[PDB]
Amino acid sequence: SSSANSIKVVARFRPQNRVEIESGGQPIVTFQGPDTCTVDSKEAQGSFTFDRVFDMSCKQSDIFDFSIKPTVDDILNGYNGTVFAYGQTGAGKSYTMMGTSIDDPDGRGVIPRIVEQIFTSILSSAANIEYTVRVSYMEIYMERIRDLLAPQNDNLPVHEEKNRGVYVKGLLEIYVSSVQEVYEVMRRGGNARAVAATNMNQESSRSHSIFVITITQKNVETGSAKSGQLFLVDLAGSEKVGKTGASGQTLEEAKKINKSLSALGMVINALTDGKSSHVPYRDSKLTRILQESLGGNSRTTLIINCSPSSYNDAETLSTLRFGMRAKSIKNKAKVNAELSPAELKQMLAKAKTQ
Ligand SMILES: Nc1ncnc2c1ncn2[C@@H]1O[C@H](COP(=O)(O)OP(=O)(O)O)[C@@H](O)[C@H]1O
Numbered sequence: 001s002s003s004a005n006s007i008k009v010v011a012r013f014r015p016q017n018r019v020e021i022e023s024g025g026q027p028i029v030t031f032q033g034p035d036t037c038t039v040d041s042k043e044a045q046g047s048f049t050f051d052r053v054f055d056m057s058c059k060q061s062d063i064f065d066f067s068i069k070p071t072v073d074d075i076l077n078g079y080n081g082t083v084f085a086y087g088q089t090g091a092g093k094s095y096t097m098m099g100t101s102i103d104d105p106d107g108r109g110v111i112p113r114i115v116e117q118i119f120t121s122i123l124s125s126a127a128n129i130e131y132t133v134r135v136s137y138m139e140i141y142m143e144r145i146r147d148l149l150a151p152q153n154d155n156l157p158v159h160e161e162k163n164r165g166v167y168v169k170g171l172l173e174i175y176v177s178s179v180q181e182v183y184e185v186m187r188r189g190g191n192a193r194a195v196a197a198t199n200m201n202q203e204s205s206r207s208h209s210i211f212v213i214t215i216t217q218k219n220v221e222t223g224s225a226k227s228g229q230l231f232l233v234d235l236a237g238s239e240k241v242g243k244t245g246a247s248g249q250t251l252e253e254a255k256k257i258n259k260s261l262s263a264l265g266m267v268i269n270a271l272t273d274g275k276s277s278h279v280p281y282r283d284s285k286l287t288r289i290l291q292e293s294l295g296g297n298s299r300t301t302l303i304i305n306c307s308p309s310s311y312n313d314a315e316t317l318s319t320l321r322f323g324m325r326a327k328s329i330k331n332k333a334k335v336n337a338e339l340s341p342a343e344l345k346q347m348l349a350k351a352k353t354q
């Protein structure tokens with residue numbers, strides 16, 4: 001499947017919230033198939049079809065079992081991937097990625113469920129396959145990278161080499177040998193995020209959070225070893241900045257519009273246009289770090305979080321369309337994992353009989 005490596009887009013509608021409900025908000029979204037929805041409102045109207053659409057009744061386990069679980073199998077097999085949670089503030093990005101509390105069984109989101117599955121597979125693997133797992137947790141705000149596991153470092157640099165790709169130099173990576181150790185890592189990172197949001201004059205809705213899991217596996221009988229990494233991204237709010245509606249700071253720092261949550265849109269536009277191979281990954285550190293996830297070597301899933309309320313019809317339409325544009329993007333289908341071959345040949349040479 002060299003072309004079936006398209007970006008998966010799933011839409012998730014949460015129930016209306018208090019402000020919508022008590023402001024005269026009404027449902028404007030109807031569901032057709034398990035992959036289609038229809039909006040009918042003053043500033044909406046339209047029919048959209050994605051790889052999957054979850055209605056207001058769908059629970060956390062549904063999200064995971066119907067569109068995320070397959071991703072864990074990919075990383076466990078040496079493939080790289082990324083899962084994005086996109087949408088306006090209050091749409092359900094964090095709830096979907098981390099959940100209300102990772103300690104509330106029903107309310108826990110994608111990430112903790114991914115970790116459980118990873119350790120469950122590892123533990124049931126043949127003694128012949130030895131695994132290693134390590135995590136990183138960072139936050140990007142105003143184009144500055146903060147290590148949520150080593151908070152003092154709040155301006156980490158981004159580096160890049162031909163023989164390695166893009167990485168954050170100095171980012172702490174912690175080996176974890178159990179579901180419990182990783183869970184505490186998630187709690188620590190959450191704590192660090194609240195600290196920044198509370199004491200650093202930083203808008204929590206305008207920062208991106210990235211959880212990185214890297215799994216290495218070695219077949220001790222063949223001496224062959226490979227790895228796969230998964231980036232779990234909770235993006236900043238996608239609503240229009242307008243520098244007029246939330247008490248804007250200095251008009252300069254209002255470079256918010258230029259930020260990654262804009263660089264992401266420009267990157268998506270360029271890829272869907274396809275007339276130029278010069279995609280603007282550099283417009284932001286987010287898009288540089290995740291450049292392979294957009295048009296490169298990666299199994300990518302985009303979760304667009306939407307409100308089903310007429311109160312937020314305009315933003316929900318903007319989000320759906322964005323999701324529609326990302327849908328037509330095809331990712332690079334090269335470099336599998338273990339030798340079998342994982343395809344039909346995978347030996348790009350030329351001839352060289354000698
Ligand atoms: N699908 C859902 N079901 C029930 N409550 C939800 C759901 N999705 C989101 N919420 C609630 O949404 C409110 C704000 O959502 P949040 O996930 O913080 O989203 P965002 O990060 O996109 O701002 C929270 O109090 C959250 O628990």
Ligand SMILES: [Mg+2]
Pocket residue numbers: 093094095234
């Ligand atoms: Mg959030």
